[PDB]
C-alpha cells in the first residue's frame, strides 16, 4: 500500500474523490504519527489520492495488527471499526481512485499499480483463500442420534429416511432451540459441534463450502443445514455432497434430484448447488475405464437433473495428479 | 480483622492448628507486603493464630478489592481463588482457631472477640443481607404467553389452570431449551428475563426468596421455577406466594395444598416451604376485624396443610408499622 501511495501523486480528481479526501483530512488526526516510516506527516489535500490511500494504509495497519493479536493471543483490543471487516470496504476507496483517474483522463495511470491492487483485493480478499470444511456424513448422524436420544424422541440412526426428512423439516421450519448446554457429547460429537462453533466465531468470508463425505440421502445435507443453524452459524456455508465411490457416482443423480425435491431446501439454495465428484476411489474398486465412463455419465445426468430444477450446478472435480486418480 | 490479629497472640495450639499454620507459613510469600499498614512482615510461626488470621486478612483484602472493582467498573482482575467465595470458606479458619483455643484451655479467650467475629460471619455472611425479589404474577404470565405464542403452541393467557400446570410440568421435567435468543420481548418481558439473568450472574448466597405478588394457583409458582431454570439460574432460589387481598387469603390453604399435591414440586421443595401473608390490603377492602380474623384462620389452615404434607412451613408476615397495616 505504501508504494501505491507513492505513485498516486496526481492533483486532479473528481468532485467525488475531492469531497472524500476533504472528509479524511477533516478527521485527519493532526498528530506525529511516528509509527509509520514514510508519510508520517498528515497528507495534504493537494494530492487527494495520497490522502485516501493513506487512510487505506491506516485500516490495513489496524487489520493486520488485529489479526496478529487474534492469532498470537486469544483476543485483540484493536477496534473492529478501525479495521477492514468487509470484503470490499477495502475495495470501495480504490474503486473511488479508479473512477477519479478515469474521469480526469488518467485511465492509463489507473490501469497500473492501482489496477493490479484492485485485482489482488478482489481475488485474495481479506483472507487469501476461502476455506472448505469436510466431514463424513456418519458423524453428523451420530450427532443427530445423540440429540434425538437425549430429547427422548427416538433414535435418529434407527429412523428411516422418510422419518428423518419429516423431523428435519419440522425442526428446520421450527423456531425453538434443539439441544442445550447439557447435551451428552462424545469427543467425535464435540469435534463436529465445535467445528460449527468455530465457523460461527470466525468471519464469513473466511470459509467456503461444507463437504459431506459418504453422502447418500437428502437427510445427510439437511442434517448439516440444521446443525449449522442450530450452532448459531450467522452466515451458514453451502452444503455440498461428495460422490467418490463407483456405487455413489452411479446413484448421485437420483439422490441430488431427491434433494431438489424438498421445496424447503430448493428455495433456500438460491438457484445454486455445488456437488463434488471424486476421482480417486472409483477406479480402485472397479476398472479405470469403467470408472472414467461412469464419471462422465454421472456429470451428464447431474446436469440433466439440475436443468430439470432450474438450478445452476457447478461441479467440484476431485482430481488427482496421477492419471490413476 | 487487624485488631483480631493483634489480640490472638497466644503460642499454644493443637497439633491441628499447628499443622495448618505450618502450611500457611510454607506458602508464606516472603515479600515486603507493604500494602498493609500493620503486620507487613511475614508472620512467624511462634504465634500460630496470627498466621491463620493473617491468611484470613489476605483473602479479606482481595475480597474487598474485588467487590470494589466489580462495583466501580464492570469487572475485576482479582482472581476468584484469591477471595472468599464460600459462606464458610471464611468460617473454616475461625472455627479452627476456636477449636484450638478450647482444646488448650483458653475457652474464655475464644468466647470474646473471636466469638463476636464468628457470630458476625455466621449472621451477616459475605453480603450483609440476602435480597428478596418480588414480582406480580401477571408479568410472568406475560412472559410465558410470549413464549408459547412465539413457539406457535397457543396462548398461555387463554389457557385454563389445568393446561398451564401440565405444560409447565412437562417443560420443568423436560431437557430441551424453551425460548431462544430471538424471542420477541417487551420492555416488561425483557425486564423480568433480565432480572433472572442478573440473578444467574451473581453469587447464590446474595439472594433470598422469589416472592410472587397476586399468587392464586400452583401455575404461578411453577412459572417462576421454569423461568428460573430456563434462564440458567445455577442455584434457583425458593419461590414464595404472597396472599395479601382477603379473597386470596380465604383460598390460600386450598391453593398451597394443590401445589403440594404436585409430586414433582413436593420432591424438590425438600420438605420446607415458605408462603407470605400480607397485612396491608386485607384491612382495606374489608373490615379491620374481619381481616385480622381471616388472617388467623389463614395461618391456622396453612399449618394444617403443611402438616398434612409433611412440609416445614415458615410463614412470612408482611406486617406494617401502623395497626391499620
Swiss-Prot record, chains A, B:
Inducing stimuli: Upon inorganic phosphate (Pi) deprivation.
Descriptive protein name: Phosphoenolpyruvate carboxylase 1
Function: Through the carboxylation of phosphoenolpyruvate (PEP) it forms oxaloacetate, a four-carbon dicarboxylic acid source for the tricarboxylic acid cycle. Contributes probably to the adaptation to inorganic phosphate (Pi) deprivation.
Covered range of the whole protein: 319 to 643 of 967
Tissue distribution: Expressed in all plant organs, with higher levels in roots.
Localisation per UniProt entry: Cytoplasm
Enzyme active site: 284
Classification of source organism: Eukaryota, Viridiplantae, Streptophyta, Embryophyta, Tracheophyta
PTM comment: Enhanced activity by phosphorylation at pH 7.3 by lowering Km and sensitivity to inhibition by L-malate and L-aspartate, while enhancing activation by glucose 6-phosphate.
Family that this chain belongs to: Belongs to the PEPCase type 1 family.
Subunit and interaction comment: Homotetramer.
Amino acid at each position: 500500500i505504501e508504494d501505491l501511495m507513492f505513485e498516486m501523486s496526481m492533483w486532479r480528481c473528481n468532485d467525488e474523490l475531492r469531497a472524500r479526501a476533504d472528509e479524511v483530512h477533516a478527521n485527519s488526526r493532526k498528530d506525529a504519527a511516528k509509527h509509520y516510516i514514510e508519510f508520517w506527516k498528515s497528507i495534504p489535500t493537494t494530492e487527494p489520492y495520497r490522502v485516501i490511500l493513506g487512510d487505506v494504509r491506516d485500516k490495513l495497519y489496524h487489520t493486520r495488527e488485529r489479526a496478529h493479536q487474534l492469532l498470537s493471543n486469544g483476543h485483540s483490543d484493536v477496534p473492529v471499526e478501525a479495521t477492514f471487516i468487509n470484503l470490499e470496504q477495502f475495495l470501495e476507496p480504490l474503486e473511488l481512485c479508479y473512477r477519479s483517474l478515469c474521469s480526469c483522463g488518467d485511465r492509463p495511470i489507473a490501469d497500473g499499480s492501482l489496477l493490479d491492487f484492485l485485482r489482488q483485493v478482489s481475488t485474495f480478499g481479506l483472507s487469501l483463500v476461502r476455506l472448505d470444511i469436510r466431514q463424513e456424513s456418519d458423524r453428523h448422524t451420530d450427532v443427530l442420534d445423540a440429540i434425538t436420544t437425549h430429547l427422548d424422541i427416538g433414535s435418529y440412526r434407527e429412523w428411516s429416511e422418510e422419518r428423518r426428512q419429516e423431523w428435519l423439516l419440522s425442526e428446520l421450519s421450527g423456531k425453538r432451540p434443539l439441544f442445550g448446554s447439557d447435551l451428552p457429547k462424545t469427543e467425535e460429537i464435540a469435534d463436529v459441534l465445535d467445528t460449527f462453533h468455530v465457523i460461527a466465531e470466525l468471519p464469513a468470508d473466511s470459509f467456503g463450502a461444507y463437504i459431506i463425505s459418504m453422502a447418500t440421502a437428502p437427510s445427510d445435507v439437511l442434517a448439516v443445514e440444521l446443525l449449522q443453524r442450530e450452532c448459531r452459524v450467522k452466515q451458514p456455508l453451502r452444503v455440498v455432497p461428495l460422490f467418490e465411490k463407483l456405487a455413489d457416482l452411479e446413484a448421485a443423480p437420483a439422490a441430488v434430484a431427491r434433494l431438489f425435491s424438498v421445496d424447503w431446501y430448493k428455495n433456500r439454495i438460491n438457484g445454486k448447488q455445488e456437488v463434488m465428484i471424486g476421482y480417486s476411489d472409483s477406479g480402485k474398486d472397479a476398472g479405470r475405464l469403467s470408472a472414467a465412463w461412469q464419471l462422465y455419465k454421472a456429470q451428464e445426468e447431474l446436469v440433466k437433473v439440475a436443468k430439470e430444477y432450474g438450478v445452476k450446478l457447478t461441479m467440484f472435480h476431485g482430481r488427482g495428479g496421477t492419471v490413476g486418480r
